[PDB]
Amino acid sequence: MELAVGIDLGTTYSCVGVFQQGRVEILANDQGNRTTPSYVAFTDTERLVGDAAKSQAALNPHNTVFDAKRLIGRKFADTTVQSDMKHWPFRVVSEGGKPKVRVCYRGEDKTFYPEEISSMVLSKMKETAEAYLGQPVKHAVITVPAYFNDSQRQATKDAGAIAGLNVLRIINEPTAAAIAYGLDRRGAGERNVLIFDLGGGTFDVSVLSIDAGVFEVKATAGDTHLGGEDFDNRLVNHFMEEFRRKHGKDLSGNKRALRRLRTACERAKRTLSSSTQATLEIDSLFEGVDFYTSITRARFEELCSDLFRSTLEPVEKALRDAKLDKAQIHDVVLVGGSTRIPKVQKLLQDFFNGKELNKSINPDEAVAYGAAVQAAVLMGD
Ligand SMILES: Nc1ncnc2c1ncn2[C@@H]1O[C@H](COP(=O)(O)OP(=O)(O)O)[C@@H](O)[C@H]1O
Ligand SMILES: [Mg+2]
């Protein structure tokens, strides 16, 4: 009766599914969400993980950790680590050439390796599954980006082990998304698959060839610093200029106000994926002044148009590297929460001369969904 789970340990949002009784169930968390921010907050009395960690970042910025995936399996001296450090409000230090994050927890100075932070997220996902299933969960498939190296892969497996999971297999995110749609189980014949994965922090284009169930990654392109959080930042800039005009103050040096604004921006952005208009409502944003306004989809689309358009160059480069024409791609699959933006879908579809996109599985859940299938395969006979 033991079920294994599939876990997407994502840069910004993680997700857990289980293959049970015909179907794959993606599990809702402590606040009812099907994805969970990869955030851990250390307070005076609690260690919070996920949504409650993210929501109290405004008030406790130095002890609220995120982006651990960006440190995992790297050295402190790496140029990408030193660059990313300038943008984080939590301290990163060096221990034996390895990054650790430094925080205050229960009034005490503590340091943790990136795999320890990631194990806390994986422990939450494990317990989330246990609450739903009403039984122990001891086995998992965990996904990683196609470009992860061996030491990044081992360090992710260790995060799993530290969380009490026996890791059945570390599989690539784009391969998991293809498995989610059964693309490796369409009989004989090679197929070429393009995975367009636009997440919260990273953009990944992968060209896969599938034959007799064997996956080969033909090409990858993208940008590790393009994702939903950049669309949030465009909205943040728009609304701080609107706050200036409406209320006569610049809030660009008040970190707390900018963080509260960022939260309200991300919500508004999500609403614009299914409505043409969204309100933005924040009590006491700055010096006790409330900020209540709205924005159209069309205006959000203008604000990010260069960013959206830029996602097509990597698609083209990847196809070039794979030595394929776009008409030779059998399947295009939407992955990542940012591919729920209607304009992003229109841009990709027009690029593929009107080809229908695989998007029936919620793009932010597709990786966990394929991992769940794969975990079931590996538990089987
Ligand atoms: N309905 C939506 N419309 C637009 N963006 C969304 C929507 N839902 C989630 N997102 C965004 O998707 C990103 C999270 O992507 P996801 O794939 O879940 O995580 P990750 O990229 O860490 O794997 C965030 O920027 C989030 O705001
Ligand atoms: Mg992802």
Numbering used by the authors: 5 to 385
What does the paper say about this structure?
The 70-kDa heat shock proteins (Hsp70) are chaperones with central roles in processes that involve polypeptide remodeling events. Hsp70 proteins consist of two major functional domains: an N-terminal nucleotide binding domain (NBD) with ATPase activity, and a C-terminal substrate binding domain (SBD). Hsp70 proteins bind and release client polypeptides in a cycle that is coupled to an ATPase activity. We present the first crystal structures of four human Hsp70 isoforms, those of the NBDs of HSPA1L, HSPA2, HSPA5 and HSPA6.
The HSPA6/Hsp70B' gene is strictly inducible with no detectable basal expression. The HSPA6 protein is nuclear and cytosolic. HSPA6 induction is a sensitive biomarker of cellular stress; the protein appears transiently in response to heat stress whereas HSPA1A/Hsp72 levels persist for days. Inorganic phosphate was present only in the solution for HSPA6. In all ATPase domains except for that of HSPA5/BiP the products of ATP hydrolysis, including inorganic phosphate, were observed. To illustrate this we color coded the rmsd in Cα atom positions between the pairs HSPA6 - HSPA1L, HSPA6 - HSPA5, and HSPA6 - E.coli DnaK, and mapped them onto the structure of HSPA6. The overall structures of the four human Hsp70 ATPase domains that were determined here for the first time all closely resemble the structure of HSPA1A and related previously determined structures.
